[PDB]
């Protein structure tokens, strides 16, 4: 029965280790992502949460019929 239908314990052992490593990495990544999101929303210095500002290319840098603009 063991030869025909089942395998050794080493296979399940090492598969369990691989699964545990994947899940632990995923958990640490989720926590890190939450912290990064909080920091980016608080500060705004990162790529995320970059709300638009007025484009400076719309400014007209020409004499304005009045020296004091």
């Amino acid at each position: 029965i063991a030869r025909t239908f089942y395998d050794g314990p080493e296979k399940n052992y090492e598969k369990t280790m691989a699964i545990l490593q994947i899940e632990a990495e995923k958990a640490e990544l989720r926590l890190k992502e939450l912290e990064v999101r909080r920091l980016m929303r608080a500060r705004g210095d990162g790529p995320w949460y970059q709300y638009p500002t007025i484009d400076k290319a719309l400014i007209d840098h020409s004499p304005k019929t009045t020296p004091d603009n």
């Binding site: 052992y13 369990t16 280790m17 545990l20 490593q21 632990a24």
Partner: protein, 175 residues
């Protein structure tokens, strides 16, 4: 027979007395024993020897599986999952081995009680004290862990016991 080890399951030298009848009346027990052995044991022995010689024609072996000694839970970092898994499996195997040790001692005690007859209270002191020591150690190790037990909980219980023992020892030495 030699099917098991005599050192782990010891037995007294098995002293039995000799028949010394005071009467010439025939003993029904001996005649019944002769009838029983002739009519039962001989065919049973013949069948068993036939089965044994059939087995001897095709002989194969099975081996006891050996496990290494991986680092325990005390040598694992706080969030290292691989070493934690290794230590947890090793601890569970050790727990099973300790359970079987307690089982062996209990079997010894039961055999002593049955064998010694009416003197079991006095003739089974060594087995009783062995069981007392083994049960005390097992209770110190694994009792009150509850369901969802783990190597970490056992380690915490041991650390608490060691802290209490150290406090008591220093208080005693402070006298």
């Amino acid at each position: 027979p030699d099917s098991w080890d005599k050192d782990v399951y010891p037995e007294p030298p098995r002293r039995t007395p000799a028949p010394a009848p005071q009467t010439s009346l025939p003993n029904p027990v001996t005649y019944l024993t002769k009838i029983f052995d002739l009519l039962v044991d001989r065919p049973v022995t013949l069948a068993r020897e036939f089965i044994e010689q059939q087995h001897a024609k095709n002989r194969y072996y099975y081996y006891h599986r050996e496990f290494r000694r991986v680092p325990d839970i005390t040598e694992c970092e706080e969030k290292d999952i691989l070493c934690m898994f290794e230590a947890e499996m090793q601890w569970r195997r050790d727990y099973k081995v300790d359970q079987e040790i307690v089982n062996i001692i209990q079997e010894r005690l039961k055999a002593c009680q049955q064998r010694e007859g009416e003197s079991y209270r006095q003739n089974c002191a060594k087995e009783l004290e062995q069981f007392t020591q083994v049960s005390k150690a097992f209770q110190d190790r694994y009792s009150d862990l509850g369901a969802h037990y783990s190597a970490r909980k056992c380690l915490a219980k041991q650390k608490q016991r060691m802290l209490a023992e150290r406090k008591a020892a220093k208080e005693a030495a402070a006298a």
